[PDB]
Amino acid sequence: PEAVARLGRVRWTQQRHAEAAVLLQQASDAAPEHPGIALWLGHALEDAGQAEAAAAAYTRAHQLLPEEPYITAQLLNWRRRLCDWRALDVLSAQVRAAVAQGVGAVEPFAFLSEDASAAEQLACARTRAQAIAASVRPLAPTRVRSKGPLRVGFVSNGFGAHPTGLLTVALFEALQRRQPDLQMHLFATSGDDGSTLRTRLAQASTLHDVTALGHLATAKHIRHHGIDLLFDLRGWGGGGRPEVFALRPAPVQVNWLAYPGTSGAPWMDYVLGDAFALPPALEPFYSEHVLRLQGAFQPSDTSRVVAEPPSRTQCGLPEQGVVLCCFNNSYKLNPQSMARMLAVLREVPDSVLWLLSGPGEADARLRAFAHAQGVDAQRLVFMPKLPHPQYLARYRHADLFLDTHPYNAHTTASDALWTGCPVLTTPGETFAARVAGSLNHHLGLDEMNVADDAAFVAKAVALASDPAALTALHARVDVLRRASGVFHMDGFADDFGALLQALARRHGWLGI
Numbered sequence: 001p002e003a004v005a006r007l008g009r010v011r012w013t014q015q016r017h018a019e020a021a022v023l024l025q026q027a028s029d030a031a032p033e034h035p036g037i038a039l040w041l042g043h044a045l046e047d048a049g050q051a052e053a054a055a056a057a058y059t060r061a062h063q064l065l066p067e068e069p070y071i072t073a074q075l076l077n078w079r080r081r082l083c084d085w086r087a088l089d090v091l092s093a094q095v096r097a098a099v100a101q102g103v104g105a106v107e108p109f110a111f112l113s114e115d116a117s118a119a120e121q122l123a124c125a126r127t128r129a130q131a132i133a134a135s136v137r138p139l140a141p142t143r144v145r146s147k148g149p150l151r152v153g154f155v156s157n158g159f160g161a162h163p164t165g166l167l168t169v170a171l172f173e174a175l176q177r178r179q180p181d182l183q184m185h186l187f188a189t190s191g192d193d194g195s196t197l198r199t200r201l202a203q204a205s206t207l208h209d210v211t212a213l214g215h216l217a218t219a220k221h222i223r224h225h226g227i228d229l230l231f232d233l234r235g236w237g238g239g240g241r242p243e244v245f246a247l248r249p250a251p252v253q254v255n256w257l258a259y260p261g262t263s264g265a266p267w268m269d270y271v272l273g274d275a276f277a278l279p280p281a282l283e284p285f286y287s288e289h290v291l292r293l294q295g296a297f298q299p300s301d302t303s304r305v306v307a308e309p310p311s312r313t314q315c316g317l318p319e320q321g322v323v324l325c326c327f328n329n330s331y332k333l334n335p336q337s338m339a340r341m342l343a344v345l346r347e348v349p350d351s352v353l354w355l356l357s358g359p360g361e362a363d364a365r366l367r368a369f370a371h372a373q374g375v376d377a378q379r380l381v382f383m384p385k386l387p388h389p390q391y392l393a394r395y396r397h398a399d400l401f402l403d404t405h406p407y408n409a410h411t412t413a414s415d416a417l418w419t420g421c422p423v424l425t426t427p428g429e430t431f432a433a434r435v436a437g438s439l440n441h442h443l444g445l446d447e448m449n450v451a452d453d454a455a456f457v458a459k460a461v462a463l464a465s466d467p468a469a470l471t472a473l474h475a476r477v478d479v480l481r482r483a484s485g486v487f488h489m490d491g492f493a494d495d496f497g498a499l500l501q502a503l504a505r506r507h508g509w510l511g512i
C-alpha cells in the first residue's frame with residue numbers, strides 16, 4: 001500500500017493518469033485510513049477527469065485530518081467547483097479562520113470565492129506571499145534603463161485561446177501600431193495551441209516561449225531582455241509562476257488584469273485598476289501602490305465578429321420567453337447567486353436560465369436546487385464546452401445576463417456586453433465583486449448596477465416581464481457599446497502607453 005501509492009505516483013508523473021488512479025485506488029482500498037494516500041488518490045482522479053470521485057477522496061482526507069487547514073481549503077474549493085454545498089458554511093468559516101491565524105494553506109485565488117472582506121483577502125495574499133518570499137533569494141537588483149525604447153513585459157499562461165490573451169490582443173495590436181516607443185514582450189508559460197489568438201499575439205509582440213523553463217531560469221530569461229516594467233497577468237491563479245516574480249527579474253512589477261485582487265506581495269510594486277472597481281476606499285487593502293487607467297481596467301478583443309448562433313431550439317432553449325443567462329465559472333455559482341437568479345425565474349413565468357455545463361454533477365445539483373427553490377428543473381439549460389467563436393455566438397439568444405456575487409463574471413461579462421447583452425450586477429465591496437459594475441459604469445449603464453439582492457430581483461423581474469423595456473435596454477447597450485471608450489482599444493492603447501511612460505519617468509527614465 002505504501003509502495004503501490006508511489007508507483008502510481010510515478011505513473012502520475014508520466015501522464016499515465018488512467019493507471020495512477022487504479023493504483024492509488026488499490027492502495028486507498030487496502031489502507032482506507034491513510035490521509036496522505038487519500039490525498040494523492042484525489043489529485044490522481046482529478047487529473048484523470050474523475051471530478052466526483054476526486055472530491056470523494058478529499059472528503060475522506062478531511063474526515064481523517066480534520067484539523068488540517070490545507071486539506072479543508074482543498075475540499076471547499078472542490079465542492080464549490082461541483083456546486084456541492086454540503087456544509088459550505090462550516091468549511092467556509094474554517095478557511096477564513098485559517099487565514100486569520102495563517103498559516104498559510106488557503107490559496108488566494110480560491111479564496112476569491114468566499115464571502116470575505118478586502119481585508120481578509122489581503123491577509124490571505126500576504127500570508128502566502130511571505131512563505132514564498134522567504135524561501136527564495138532575489139536576483140541582483142537592477143534599475144529602469146535611462147535611455148531608450150522602454151521594454152515592457154507580460155507573463156501569462158493564457159496567451160492564446162484563454163482569458164488573458166483573449167482580453168489583451170486587440171490591445172497588444174493597438175500598441176504596436178500607436179505606441180512605437182514601447183517594446184512589447186510576452187512571456188508565454190503555455191505552448192502554441194494553434195489558436196488564431198496565439199498567432200495574432202505572436203504577430204503583435206515579441207513572444208517568448210518560456211514553457212520549457214523553470215522558475216529560476218524564467219526569471220533569468222526575463223532579465224536577459226532587461227525588461228523595465230513587468231506585468232504579472234497570471235496571477236495567484238493556476239499555471240504559476242509567482243516565484244518567478246519573487247526573483248524580481250524586473251525592477252518594476254505591476255499586477256494587472258488576471259488576478260482580481262491584491263497580491264499581498266512585497267515583490268510587487270503596483271496594481272493597475274480603475275476608479276470604480278478599485279476606488280479610494282479600497283486602497284488601504286492593497287499592498288501595491290494603486291494606478292488607474294482613465295476608463296475600465298479591462299481591455300477586450302474588439303475585432304471579433306460575433307457569429308450567428310444555431311436556432312434557440314438547437315441550443316436547447318424554448319422559442320418564446322426571456323432567456324436570462326449566467327455563463328461563469330462553476331465555483332462562482334454560490335447559494336446566494338443561484339437563489340437570486342432562481343427568484344427571478346419564480347416571479348417571471350415564461351422564462352428560462354441558461355448556464356455553462358459544469359464539471360462532475362454540478363448540473364444535476366443546480367437542477368435539484370432549482371426544484372428545492374420551487375422551480376421546474378427543465379427551466380435550467382446547460383451549454384457544453386465550445387470553441388470561443390461558437391460560444392461567443394450563443395449570447396445572441398441571451399436576453400439578460402445575471403452576474404454572480406461575490407466573484408463577478410470577468411471575461412464573460414465583457415463577452416456579453418460586446419455582443420449587446422445587458423449585464424445586471426450588485427457591485428460589492430472588493431475588486432473582484434466590482435468588475436461587472438466597472439464595465440457597466442464605464443459603458444454608461446449605471447441603472448444596471450443595483451444596491452442589493454432584493455434590488456437585483458426587482459430590476460430583473462422588471463425587465464423580464466416588460467419586453468418593451470427589455471428591447472429598449474438592448475438598444476441602449478448598442479448605442480453605448482460603440483460610443484463609450486470601453487470598447488475603443490485605440491484610446492485604451494494611448495491611455496495605457498502614456499500611463500506606462502509616466503511610471504517609467506518616476507523610476508528615472510529619460511524617455512526618447
Ligand SMILES: O=C1NC(=O)C(=O)C(=O)N1
Nearest residue numbers: 356384385386387388391
Ligand atoms: O471561450 C470560452 N469557451 C467556453 O467553452 C467557455 O465555457 C468559456 O467560458 N469561454
